[PDB]
Amino acid sequence: MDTFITRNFQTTIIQKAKNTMAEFSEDPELQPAMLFNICVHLEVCYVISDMNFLDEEGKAYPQYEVIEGMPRTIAWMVQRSLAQEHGIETPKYLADLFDYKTKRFIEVGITKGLADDYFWKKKEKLGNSMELMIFSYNQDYSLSNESSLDEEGKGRVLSRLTELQAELSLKNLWQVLIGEEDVEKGIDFKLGQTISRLRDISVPAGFSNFEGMRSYIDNIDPKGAIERNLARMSPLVSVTPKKLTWEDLRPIGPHIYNHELPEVPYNAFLLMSDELGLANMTEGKSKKPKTLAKECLEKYSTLRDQTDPILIMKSEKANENFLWKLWRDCVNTISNEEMSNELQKTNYAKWATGDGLTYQKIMKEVAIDDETMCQEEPKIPNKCRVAAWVQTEMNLLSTLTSKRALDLPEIGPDVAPVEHVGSERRKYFVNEINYCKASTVMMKYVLFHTSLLNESNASMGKYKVIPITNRVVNEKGESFDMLYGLAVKGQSHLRGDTDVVTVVTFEFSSTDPRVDSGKWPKYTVFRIGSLFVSGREKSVYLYCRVNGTNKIQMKWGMEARRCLLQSMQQMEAIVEQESSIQGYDMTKACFKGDRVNSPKTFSIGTQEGKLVKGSFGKALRVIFTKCLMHYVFGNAQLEGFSAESRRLLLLIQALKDRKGPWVFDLEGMYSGIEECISNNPWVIQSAYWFNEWLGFEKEGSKV
């Protein structure tokens, strides 16, 4: 088909048809029949307007103005100008040709059958406001006015179309030739009574029927209406511009400094800085989690065989006995021989997670009749002050440990300079954050959530024991299989994915909770035994906690591995900005330093109230830890606070660059930000750090 199009027509005609039809906002390839029709129509109208010419008085020796082919905007404005200059009605459809003699717009068309019916239906479509000439492949012609075209033009057009018709059937193209009326089948659209009434009752105040609105829109000249409306508008409608200044900015959410409010609890799913993995060196083979947990407990047999618990702390509502018996059942199941990791002593599991205390649903009619059934008030989040453990979390998760848990596959050889730059950036990033404790915590988190999601494949009405395991590698190359504790997941009879399935997790730790009583108001902790590392006894506690999460939360935890890409993108944006200051890449220079440049240093934190600098590696580690904490501590409060602190930070930046920022309703922004600082540890610590950094910027801007 397309070959016929490019062979039977000149390149200019094909290009004009293609660019005029591509404005339909659709694929021009899969439907080329209309392309052929439009090309033939363009050729016909071009031929029609190449033989007859006019003069100062109208000597026949141009007379035809071509509107099709040109851009629709230019064509429409030209048609409107012609109609205005000639004092004639403008056709509602874009006429394909205009005549200077008759002072009327005209249309052309191509068909396959008799042209009389086509002409009559086109007349019905356009009424009598436009003239037409029509030709058909089967030697038929129709003209509204016999004084429109001469014999030469009609004969040439007829010969061309007859030749095209004859040639089409030679390559089996006439069979697939679509007609012309199909593209304009729908021209009748009559509204029913109901829809007409709905339209009539949907007009702005001041009109009775939609006819009045239509006439008002099509007739009235509203020039100058905006000024008239604005003149009488009250002066009270003002943005109230206010130039911003350094002193205008104030600390956000000072209540967090109120010592009366309680400390923020530790609501993260898994222990991050207090983890304790029972290392068990392995060759490197992959084994089922149950076998790994069994071997790890066998190595530390003393902890496994602990039956008398030395309770150290208790939650407000949880029962220590039930949790301990559930943990004993979990370890018994882990240490058995059956392949399945399914609990068989469902008693304590059922009675420990409060799975039997759920209310029973009754028919709505009884509730309506009943008077004691009333909606319960929403438990709005409490308000808490600064929690000192978030600072320790951030400090420790950014340190370099002796083990790494990242092993990514390989990539093809790098050739292009951009590939070399990307590979260098990746090398520096991984080298910097390979052993960072945040990476290991992130891997544990994602692996545990993946296992939780997998266990929900077919087991939904049964309790499943899942060990919190991890695969780690050290500098020497020997790889270990760490076990961080266990967790039993309950049943979710409902098939919904956003339905909480209660899971209770027992994680080992080496930190005595009594040191920070406010850090664990939600944990039940025992003391199982004592490990020896360098001949010295260090205690081991078992933090037992009930929790509730849904399948979508499992998916979120699984995707929590995106913190790596997030941190890499942030570092790459920093490097791209540094390189954009210059004209060349700044990766090695800002990491290691070249002859011209020096190793870039970033302000990391505070030491005894004084600023401290550090290498770009420390900044990368802090960025990764911040991203991981943001993902782990994520709730609606955190995202809202970040979204509003965006605006506050942008205003501060504008202030720094001496751009003279102006604020309209500053207190509105401050209220929007403070609306989200209620109980999230990450949000509260972010507010504290923002206040500290704002103070530092204020005190440093006076120099």
Partner: protein, 720 residues
């Protein structure tokens, strides 16, 4: 050393520092619950900002209607939905004069596209509210159900194929006195199931015919159901909104101010070009200011009547039928009825009970039994509530349904460029929710006077600028749709990142889809080389985990890994092996658009090439770019219930349970001894009993008398 991450901002510009703060461009799982309470609050707020308008009673749907257009102008900075028609018409006139021949061309193109389009286009969409069952269903299923109901009601628009006949039949169906349709009804179960009693209860659906009066169908069609979109619209509205949005997109494409449908680095080019253009024509010695404005309650203030006025003004010179077709959508929206969802939940702690109150019975109980906020919300919503658990809602836009028209209105607001012939000129960009405004004047005082005039003007058009989320600064640094621009540098706030796992089609298809997704992320969202390479690494890891196709030279063990290791040992061209066969990955930035088969063809073993690309292999049998080989297999996709009538009538007879019980013993005594493959279960039983009798006699469990007795009975069966 207490870390302080914010200190990074000291050494790095904040625009770069906060780059990619949110890894997700979609929706989190912990967002404030969007249930009946949220939709009630939305309708309450929509009616609150327009309560000074004209309140009347619809004579068609019999619901309360509020019309704020041409209402009193605001006397306070609070959000207002009172948009004067004259100001909107003048703004459209100014836009048309500035861009001559734009509205006519856009309307012509939209009408031509509508003429050439087909009903199937409606199937490309998110969840759609099906009215026959009154739920949320896929677009294809909703369209099929609507077509079937129309056919039952002597409406055959889909038969003609065109979209115009379909919409004509929709508006005609809006006129039938009684509408008959199909619906699905669930009935409990009594068929056996082996848990501990061979008996279980479930729900089985059946198709039934239901009729509804005219008013009921009218109300149902206008209903908006709720599942950051807040609600979805049925099929009766989809075609008209599609046409109107196509028109608005045609207009916007040629509007330099419009920020849509730009995507990719073109967005950065538009941003920088706008900044440069505004700075170039700044008055000599004047000041240029930039506002990163935001709009509060954007869709809770725009009125469908104003959109109707805009559509009428745009299509002022067009065929009357097309004008009506364009107008059918705004009028449908002006009568939209919201559905409040599931309902509330009320509990009694003393008796440990809870119950769910559905929307129709929202007011069936004293308001004192609802908490304070719900009590107040119901008290305020009482006037705009219907007895059928739905709320009348004339104003508002319930998030994005006329985003293109919203952008057109914003561009119209930005096109005035002056009020009172003062010494300020404004312009900027806007994409359907957010606008960046650049104003050039002599001194900052005149720039702020111009900003105030623009604020008042947009107030007159119903657009409410956010004073609590907007700021102004010297031009050169600003934001536009989560894209920070700063003196040439450009950064992103939230970037979508590849999700864990493979696409979910097959080995080669999944690899191709992953690579093309990475390429598209690089092209559009601006992912750096290092980030893209790390994404490639992560995708390879996930792919290998999912397909158990680790490296052939690795030391991992698996059912497929033994054959992979053998192939790796036997192969010479180890660089040519595909990743799916434990080979080495070679993908990188320069070759993210080449299928791995084409990449490795030159290195593949000729025998391996023949085996892999065998023209007739049993796996392949009968977007993205890949190669059709033995790795393009298809997974079994056959589930659910077929032969519904026969199975239902069999299960409803009686003796099915006895047949199952007899089948269970014999065919579960052994794990698999079933001559499956369409064998009649009676035939399989006959064969099984014949073999059992043979074995019993051979081992001596039965005497010859029992043997012969069994063979005679089996002789009567017919398979012996």
């Amino acid at each position: 050393m207490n870390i302080n991450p914010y200190f990074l901002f000291i050494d790095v510009p904040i625009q770069a520092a906060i780059s990619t703060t949110f890894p997700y461009t979609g929706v989190p799982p912990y967002s404030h619950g969007t249930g009946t309470g949220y939709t009630i609050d939305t309708v309450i707020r929509t009616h609150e900002y327009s309560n000074k308008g004209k309140q009347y009673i619809s004579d068609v749907t019999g619901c309360t209607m509020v019309d704020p257009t041409n209402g009193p102008l605001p006397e306070d900075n609070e959000p207002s939905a009172y948009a004067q028609l004259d100001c909107v018409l003048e703004a459209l006139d100014r836009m048309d004069e500035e861009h001559p021949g734009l509205f006519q061309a856009a309307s012509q193109n939209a009408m031509e596209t509508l003429m050439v389009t087909t009903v199937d286009k409606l199937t490309q969409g998110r969840q759609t509210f099906d009215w026959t069952v009154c739920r949320n269903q896929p677009a294809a299923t909703a369209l099929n159900t609507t077509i079937t109901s129309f056919r039952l009601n002597d409406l055959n628009g889909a038969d003609k194929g065109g979209l115009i006949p379909f919409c004509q039949d929709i508006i005609d169906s809006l006129d039938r006195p009684e509408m008959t349709f199909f619906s699905v009804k669930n009935i409990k179960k009594k068929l056996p199931a082996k848990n501990r009693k061979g008996f279980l209860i479930k729900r089985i659906p059946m198709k039934v015919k239901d009729k509804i009066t005219k008013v009921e169908y009218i109300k149902r069609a206008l209903s908006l159901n709720t599942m950051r979109a807040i609600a979805t619209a049925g099929i009766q509205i989809r075609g008209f909104v599609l046409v109107v949005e196509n028109l608005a997109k045609n207009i916007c494409e040629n509007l330099e101010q419009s920020g849509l449908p730009v995507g990719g680095n073109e967005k950065k080019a538009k941003l920088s070009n706008a900044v440069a253009k505004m700075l170039s024509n700044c008055p000599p010695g004047g000041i240029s200011m930039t506002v990163t404005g935001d709009n509060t309650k954007w869709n809770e203030c725009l009125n469908p009547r104003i959109f109707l006025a805009m559509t009428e003004r745009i299509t002022r010179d067009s065929p009357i039928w097309f004008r009506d077709f364009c107008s059918i959508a705004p009028v449908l929206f002006s009568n939209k009825i919201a559905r409040l969802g599931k309902g509330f939940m009320i509990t009694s702690k003393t008796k440990r009970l809870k119950a769910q109150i559905p929307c129709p019975d929202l007011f069936s109980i004293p308001l004192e039994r609802y908490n304070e906020e719900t009590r107040a919300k119901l008290k305020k919503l009482k006037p705009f509530f219907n007895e059928e658990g739905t709320a009348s809602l004339s104003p508002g836009m319930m998030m994005g349904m006329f985003n293109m028209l919203s952008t057109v209105l914003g561009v119209a607001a930005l096109g005035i460029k002056n009020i009172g012939n003062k010494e300020y000129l404004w312009d900027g960009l806007q994409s359907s929710d957010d606008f960046a405004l650049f104003v050039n004047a002599k001194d900052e005082e005149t720039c702020m006077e111009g900003i105030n005039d623009f604020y008042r003007t947009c107030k007159l058009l119903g657009i409410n600028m956010s004073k609590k989320k907007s700021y102004c600064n010297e031009t050169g640094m600003f934001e536009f749709t989560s894209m920070f621009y700063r003196d040439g540098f450009v950064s992103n706030f939230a970037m979508e990142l590849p999700s864990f796992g493979v696409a979910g089609v097959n080995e080669s298809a999944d690899m191709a889809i992953g690579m093309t997704i990475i390429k598209n992320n690089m092209i559009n969202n601006g992912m750096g080389p290092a980030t893209a390479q790390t994404a490639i690494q992560l995708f390879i890891a996930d792919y290998r985990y999912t397909y158990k196709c680790h490296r052939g030279d690795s030391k991992v063990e698996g059912k497929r890994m033994k054959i992979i290791k053998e192939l790796w040992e036997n192969t010479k061209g180890r660089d040519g092996l595909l990743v799916a066969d434990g080979g080495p990955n070679i993908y990188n930035l320069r070759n993210l658009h080449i299928p791995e088969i084409v990449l490795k063809y030159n290195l593949m073993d000729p025998e391996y090439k023949g085996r892999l690309l065998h023209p007739q292999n049993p796996f392949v049998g009968h977007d993205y770019d890949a190669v059709s080989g033995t790795h393009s297999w298809r997974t079994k996709r056959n589930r659910s219930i077929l032969n519904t009538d026969q199975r239902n009538m069999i299960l409803e007879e009686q003796c099915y349970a006895k047949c199952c019980n007899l089948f269970e013993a014999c065919f579960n005594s052994a794990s698999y001894r079933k001559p499956v493959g369409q064998h009649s279960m009676l035939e399989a039983m006959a064969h099984r009993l014949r073999m059992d009798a043979r074995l019993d006699y051979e081992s001596g469990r039965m005497s010859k008398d029992d043997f012969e007795k069994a063979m005679a009975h089996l002789g009567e069966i017919g398979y012996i």
